[PDB]
Design an enzyme around this catalytic site. Structure first.
Site, PDB file in Angstrom:
ATOM      1  N   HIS A 100       0.849  -1.167   0.000  1.00  6.29           N
ATOM      2  CA  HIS A 100       0.000   0.000   0.000  1.00  6.29           C
ATOM      3  C   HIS A 100       0.903   1.241   0.000  1.00  6.29           C
ATOM      4  O   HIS A 100       1.965   1.223   0.612  1.00  6.29           O
ATOM      5  CB  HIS A 100      -0.808   0.066   1.278  1.00  6.29           C
ATOM      6  CG  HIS A 100      -1.741  -1.079   1.487  1.00  6.29           C
ATOM      7  ND1 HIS A 100      -1.349  -2.282   2.034  1.00  6.29           N
ATOM      8  CD2 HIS A 100      -3.077  -1.166   1.311  1.00  6.29           C
ATOM      9  CE1 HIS A 100      -2.398  -3.079   2.145  1.00  6.29           C
ATOM     10  NE2 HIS A 100      -3.458  -2.423   1.717  1.00  6.29           N
ATOM     11  N   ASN A 102       0.558   5.798  -0.063  1.00  2.00           N
ATOM     12  CA  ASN A 102      -0.354   6.952   0.004  1.00  2.00           C
ATOM     13  C   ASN A 102       0.528   8.181   0.299  1.00  2.00           C
ATOM     14  O   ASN A 102       1.316   8.142   1.254  1.00  2.00           O
ATOM     15  CB  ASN A 102      -1.336   6.727   1.159  1.00  2.00           C
ATOM     16  CG  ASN A 102      -2.400   7.843   1.266  1.00  2.00           C
ATOM     17  OD1 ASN A 102      -2.092   9.026   1.071  1.00  2.00           O
ATOM     18  ND2 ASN A 102      -3.613   7.458   1.589  1.00  2.00           N
ATOM     19  N   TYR A 103       0.469   9.223  -0.543  1.00  2.00           N
ATOM     20  CA  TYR A 103       1.123  10.533  -0.188  1.00  2.00           C
ATOM     21  C   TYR A 103       0.082  11.616  -0.461  1.00  2.00           C
ATOM     22  O   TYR A 103      -0.583  11.584  -1.515  1.00  2.00           O
ATOM     23  CB  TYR A 103       2.398  10.752  -1.029  1.00  2.00           C
ATOM     24  CG  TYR A 103       3.486   9.759  -0.624  1.00  2.00           C
ATOM     25  CD1 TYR A 103       3.799   8.670  -1.441  1.00  2.00           C
ATOM     26  CD2 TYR A 103       4.178   9.920   0.590  1.00  2.00           C
ATOM     27  CE1 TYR A 103       4.782   7.725  -1.066  1.00  2.00           C
ATOM     28  CE2 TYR A 103       5.180   8.959   0.993  1.00  2.00           C
ATOM     29  CZ  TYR A 103       5.441   7.884   0.159  1.00  2.00           C
ATOM     30  OH  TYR A 103       6.424   6.958   0.535  1.00  2.00           O
TER      31      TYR A 103
END
Length: 219
Positions: A100, A102-103
């Site tokens: 996974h 996410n940014y």
């Protein structure tokens, strides 16, 4: 000066969405296909069973009811912009790990000038079915190397099966530098994950090993 941080971040995540789906496609037989962000999805590949890479943008107001419910974790109502990329990739072969990533970025507005407040958040991890310590170690090394380009204190703080890195409410430096740290973290992804998937995706397994790992992990 440059462009506003909001513009540079949105540009960065859209370029990385394209760079990441292409990189992942390079080791599969199948292609990704395209509020409401923009979501690219891969399904029934020879390497990747299911995955998605999304970029979302949101402008609006948050009620005082909303902000009330919210401020446990950030240093009438408020106007804001946010954007982020999120991804989850699940390989066919149980020897290859899920990941996974996410940014994201958030800023408030309302008589602008520049600010009221802003922060970045994100990170990246692996969730193995079968566990290979070396794969976790490479994943960590390259994210460590990305963070060490900015300062060697960050990785020990952001680190942490395999895990990975995570930070949030992060507004501790010039946002131009934090932008570059986010770029460098993004660039840790394909060299670690494509290396790991390559070295696992053709390991032999039976249908029963795959079904048991599915039971153990869920879904």
């Amino acid at each position: 000066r440059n462009l506003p941080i909001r513009q540079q971040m949105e540009a960065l995540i859209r370029r990385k969405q394209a760079e990441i789906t292409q990189g992942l496609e390079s080791i599969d037989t199948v292609k990704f296909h395209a509020g409401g962000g923009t979501s690219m999805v891969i399904q029934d590949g020879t390497t990747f069973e299911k995955g998605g890479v999304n970029v979302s943008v949101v402008y609006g107001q948050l009620s005082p009811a909303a902000v009330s419910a919210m401020k446990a974790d950030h240093k009438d109502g408020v106007k804001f912009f946010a954007c982020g990329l999120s991804m989850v990739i699940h390989p066919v072969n149980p020897h290859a790990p899920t990941t996974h990533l996410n940014y994201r970025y958030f800023e408030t507005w309302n008589q602008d000038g520049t600010p009221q407040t802003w922060w970045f958040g994100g990170g990246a991890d692996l969730t193995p079915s079968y566990l290979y310590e070396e794969d976790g170690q490479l994943f960590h090394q390259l994210h460590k190397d990305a963070l060490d380009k900015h300062d060697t204190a960050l990785y020990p703080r952001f680190k942490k099966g395999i895990g990975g890195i995570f930070f949030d409410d992060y507004d501790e430096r010039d946002p131009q530098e934090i932008l570059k740290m986010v770029e460098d973290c993004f660039d840790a992804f394909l060299p670690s994950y494509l290396t790991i998937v390559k070295r696992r995706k053709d390991m032999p397994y039976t249908k029963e090993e795959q079904q048991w790992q599915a039971i153990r992990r869920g879904r």
